[PDB]
Enzyme design. Structure first.
Site: not given
Lengths: 327, 336, 334, 334
Positions: B154, B181
């Site tokens: 990601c 995150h």
């Protein structure tokens, strides 16, 4: 030195009982069984998200660890053969919630098992200071009930003893627990609701607590209800809505009756506290007089009691453990 | 599409697996014919239908005999810990989407091939000598003869289009990344033992800032060879359920830069994979977006030291941004 | 000398400074100013979501409230120039409202009859900015208005000082991953300062934000003026924050352990050290102004250079507050 | 027939009403009053933490305010009555500030030349309280000030109506597990509106709280006036709420399916029905005022008087907002 304890499953409850036992004279922990290395176990005892830093020297050894210079032996896993070489076991895995299942710690060496969960089969279910004097010292396997049951029992006892409890419905607004999922994910018990992101949702759920007849026989069958799990990491509230026998009851009468029965398992407050205020408390239940409601149309009675579903339950369990081991 | 179709199997029906499934339904053309995960059909179907962050699945999901039906199309499901018992040969799976997190290795992912799948696309960084692909940065390094391929991370998908522009237009000397995150499903609900010995990720995910290692900056040279070794950094996991930010601070060859030139150069590189915004948005505004990286022009600054440094930041939905990128790479990759 | 403290603005910093001042002999909070009734003030002092129950008797008496038998006077006066500070012989106001964060503006308290003001935030003007145990001995006791700096500056300064003193600091970049604060919004709504990002639901977002901590570090450590920059991200933890700092050092082949060791060796009542892999909630309630985390130390090559990343935890509430009361006491002692 | 609306207070409800009105044919917004600049208003209409991005062009072009090409006038006038309503082309002012929740008070909008006010909250005085599709046909078009009730009341009314119509309602207790709202504080801090529990950090606590929804249900359903009571627990979700209701009914021999079937049979656009085991975040953005959850029905029987438990979900933002805009449109047909 006086009462020696093995803890099976060094999860939230297992670790908090360990900490609790450090503040209770006459009780020690000698062994810890869990599937992870010592370093991880030591680390998770030392640091606690909700309960704070463990004050006390923890350092790791091979066969376990040292706490304030006392060695604790560490082991791994469930059934088949691990204690051959304890006064009482605290079963904490959440996977011996049954009598013949918990008949395994017996074979394994330890005198008594205190199960930190509701359990099936032919065993006593104990909430301390409601029904511990039911323990005679001959029991091998004992359930320590649930967190919700320990919050509800002292409240239910007073209502029944003083006003006569006809019927009641419960809702518990409950902190999320470790067996809920971080993100939406398959759940092991097939519970479509506990499969959901714990810290982002109101999650309806079943609870067995409302099995109260196992602790207070005289009100067996009279209660039911459930849970709504919400995004706080610990701390919960039990609301109870009842019909009573004694038809002309008032808010202060119920409140006074609660106050009058308080003890070290059952606290009383008139302050306007919220869930985070009960974090780390050692009452099994804290009655909140500010929340009492009586509803008249020419009565239904509602009451609420707070509990830290971690430390409240843990404190109660260690009390039951101590009483079980003076047996 | 039947025997016709490009047959996709999804191994591990977690966040990435279910989102990939949703993307595939959208895109259409390729078919998810099989799903493997260790749970029953009713749980699978329920978790596809309802999604905390990404919203209700529109379309009929119903539990039938061999699995579940989505909009009339039967999907086969299996409950199988060992992927080499999987009936990929019988169903003639073209690509297994490997999303369990347990086969994040070239050799290990070969289990699917033994079972009969032609190709595996791993939904995570992987070791050893395989190609690591960020769509619209390096998907063309693929030639259709690979059997195992990584879709990267990601974070890497959020970072690469940003890093490419900096290098191509200004010359990248060195750079530091931090990604703030969203917490993931391998993190613990409460303080408990972690499955992979990680003490930090062991902590209650929704109640902590949790420091964490990421390979994204060090392994960027897998995606962009000409900046190999020029970046490093790490991650902090925080209490949002999805939505992430990458900050990047760099030294450029051009020591005469402005906020406007930097923002302009990002803008003129936008595509489906790389978005641009000039609004002061926050993490929850990127939930469900299908760009792999969204450059945030409001966060660009040109700082001096003793030396000119340039800070930039790009948002990503670590779920849907990654997933959209993965399905783009999957579509490109069934081939040759 | 039991020096008399008035606290202006009984928010998070206000109440915590009150709790700390209980443990400082010869500082006594005699007055509290905030725009609300006594019952609310006494309740919020007694109960605290992150910091825990206040141990000790709090009771609402007629003119204000009593803490362990000592009466504390309360007022709800929005205009600080109007406070009865002369009347009460106030030596020092802990200015904690966030509305007087300027030398001239904090003068209102001096107008009201107070001797000195300590501002619980960065401030502009002609005053000193103090991080205890990094530059508090700049105080000579003639100051009338002083700033206690920021939470982030307090976390960063002792780290930066060691880097500079022992290795030579060339340049550095900071990110602080910061707990959300009280001036942030519960729901999406307008924000006082016009910040479109602090406007957003605090507990549901990663929120980028400006901080002066790295730029204004030269106020606290003159010899590294202009050498640091950085910013903040506000995230959904109610307290507990982290400061990452990545730097270039004037020393060759520096190991992770060599940096770790030099931090440990400078440790005191403000600067702690840990070698355990802790997380934000482990620093809740700690009284170090900065806690160096040896486990997050890395030495990386970026292109022919070695960049050293370090990380320091702080409880943006209690760490700051402990530092502030240390500076308050030091100022009083002079 | 193209109803023109002024929105006073561009908060959660105000902005959502604005959005809602962009999806409803025949209704339009012409003015917005709030105390903040255009850029902040436009920015908060565009981006929404829980409800998602506004699709459609918002521009502050030319230091004005435009949505999909239509200019919206913005005022910054705190004095309701100083507003330019007697200029301007309005059919109804939507009052969403929470500061005019009284019949006489809301008359400031009228003195300003307005014509009709619809209050997005419970209100005191001599006005009708309206839950759409429960009692809107009570509106005759001559009302100047009308209350749109609360979020909780809108979730509860259709449930209570069915219980009473089909089974006879004897008495009942309610709890609503309710998302935190914007009038709640981010950090433990003095609440102006001195509620010791709403003063507490909204996203970190279960917070008990009073609601008038059960007691004032007789305003919407007169035949059950006085038969209900209860309260709320505010919990850490930013939106999405649940109302549990436990009742004694007249029709003693009732079963779970009977109650469920009765609920299903009364559904419409304000009142939905589900048999899936959903959770709060599944109702975010839904436009039913109440969503009955058949999975949570409970009948308790011991041979006294039966207790029946039911639960209905609502998005305390969009559910309420959708109901409000339906009441707005209806008031404006008459």
């Amino acid at each position: 030195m006086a009462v020696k304890v093995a803890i099976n499953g060094f999860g939230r409850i297992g670790r908090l009982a360990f900490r609790r036992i450090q503040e209770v004279e006459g009780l020690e922990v000698v062994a810890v069984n869990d599937l992870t290395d010592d370093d991880m176990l030591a680390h998770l005892l030392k640091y606690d998200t909700m309960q704070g830093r463990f004050t006390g020297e923890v350092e790791v050894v091979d066969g376990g660890f040292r706490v304030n210079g006392k060695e604790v032996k560490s082991f791994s896993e469930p059934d088949a053969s691990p204690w051959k070489d304890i006064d009482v076991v605290l079963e904490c895995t959440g996977f011996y919630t049954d009598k013949d299942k918990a008949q395994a710690h017996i074979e394994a060496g330890a005198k008594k098992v205190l199960i930190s969960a509701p359990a099936t089969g032919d065993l006593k279910t104990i909430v301390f200071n409601t029904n511990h004097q039911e323990l005679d010292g001959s029991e091998t396997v004992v359930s320590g009930a649930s967190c919700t049951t320990n919050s509800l029992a002292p409240v239910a006892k007073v209502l029944n003893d003083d006003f006569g409890l006809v019927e009641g419905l419960m809702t518990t607004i409950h902190a999320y627990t470790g067996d809920q999922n971080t993100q939406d994910a398959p759940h092991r018990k097939g519970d479509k609701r506990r499969a959901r992101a714990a810290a982002e949702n109101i999650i309806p759920n079943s609870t067995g607590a409302a099995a109260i007849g196992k602790v207070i026989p005289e009100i067996d069958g009279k209660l039911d209800g459930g849970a709504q799990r919400v995004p706080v990491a610990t701390g919960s509230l039990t609301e109870l809505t009842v019909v009573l026998e004694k038809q002309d009851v008032t808010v202060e009468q119920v409140n006074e009756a609660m106050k009058n029965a308080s003890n070290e398992s059952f606290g009383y407050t008139e302050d306007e506290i919220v869930s985070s205020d009960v974090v780390g408390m050692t009452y099994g239940s804290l009655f909140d007089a500010t929340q009492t409601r009586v509803m008249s149309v020419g009565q239904l009675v509602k009451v609420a009691a707070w509990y830290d579903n971690e430390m409240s339950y843990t404190a109660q369990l260690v009390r039951t453990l101590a009483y079980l081991a003076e047996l």
